[PDB]
């Protein structure tokens with residue numbers, strides 16, 4: 001009945017437990033969902049561990065190459081990393097056939113360069129697993145072992161397990177949410193905003209975090225606290241996870257530290273000078289994915305723009321600062337006015353009637369699209385804030401950006417429809433962007 005560690009974990013508190021990948025643990029108390037009390041069968045030490053860093057000792061989830069329910073697309077973003085040798089692989093759940101699996105493998109060809117080939121793994125009614133019926137296997141493990149020795153009609157022999165990064169724990173530690181101010185050390189100033197600052201820091205002397213501070217008089221702690229309850233419930237690979245808070249003014253919001261910074265600066269950077277269309281579209285697709293989750297949760301972002309998107313490794317983009325805008329108490333800002341309100345991203349009905357919805361976020365996404373295709377250039381280049389809303393009201397829309405294909409401009413124009421309900425859904429935008437470049441090639445290589 002033992003569990004095994006899937007990744008290394010460094011202790012963060014006095015009551016938690018460090019372990020290395022592969023270490024056998026006993027779960028001596030599993031009552032709480034996200035932190036379990038465990039006990040190393042190697043060291044004898046006890047302490048709390050994040051439940052997502054372990055799997056049952058003989059399970060399929062224990063397999064280092066088994067990635068579970070991961071999209072085909074997300075699967076490709078990992079496999080295509082330039083460091084991966086050919087034959088890098090992983091196994092995941094097939095999306096299109098329930099109860100089937102999929103072996104994804106990285107390959108190189110002169111026509112295509114670097115690419116990913118997928119093989120659907122079907123399980124027989126008699127019990128076996130196979131890619132080609134010619135050769136079956138009693139488990140996924142055995143399939144993987146055989147194909148690590150002989151290619152046998154796959155593109156390449158299985159060589160290296162697809163590497164991944166450690167997943168985020170749920171919270172910084174068990175029961176940690178409203179944390180004391182003195183547990184944070186501010187180290188490097190990352191940014192400065194209209195209502196506060198962002199800092200790289202350390203929680204509890206151990207854990208690297210980012211800390212956003214709010215000026216006193218920005219919002220009430222009581223309102224901030226009720227909302228933060230809603231925000232901690234939002235969990236998605238394309239949303240910046242909020243870790244903990246300090247509710248008393250000056251308010252702190254503690255979150256994952258995204259070393260690569262905002263999408264906006266990454267776009268303007270030497271980092272952005274040579275980004276090609278396919279990458280811009282893929283970043284757009286992820287943001288739409290995060291927003292599509294917001295959309296399924298019936299939440300509203302309210303401040304969506306390139307500045308509030310954060311970048312990670314492999315061109316990962318995550319939606320940040322969601323919901324907070326609603327709580328800004330500043331007089332001018334509540335009236336959708338003043339040098340702090342992002343009018344250039346705001347749908348006309350939201351600015352005029354304070355009508356903020358997922359549809360006015362769709363409009364902001366259209367604006368964000370023009371940032372992605374113009375290296376972070378400010379929207380409405382020849383206009384000042386105080387003259388945008390009236391232009392937009394009279395039906396003015398930004399023209400197709402230089403070098404932007406009309407098709408993506410047309411998408412932007414759909415996002416900027418006068419009637420909010422005529423605007424597309426984030427679900428539509430996500431699919432449209434993910435499938436922007438049509439491949440003739442087959443979804444799965446033939447079993448043959």
Ligand SMILES: CC(C)(C)n1nc(-c2cccc3ccccc23)c2c(N)ncnc21
Nearest residue numbers: 190191210211212255256257258262320321
């Ligand atoms: C680029 C910039 C300085 C604006 N930045 N901003 C954040 C950040 C954005 C939204 C909410 C947060 C909540 C707590 C901590 C940081 C953030 C952020 C981050 N997490 N990591 C790195 N840079 C960040």
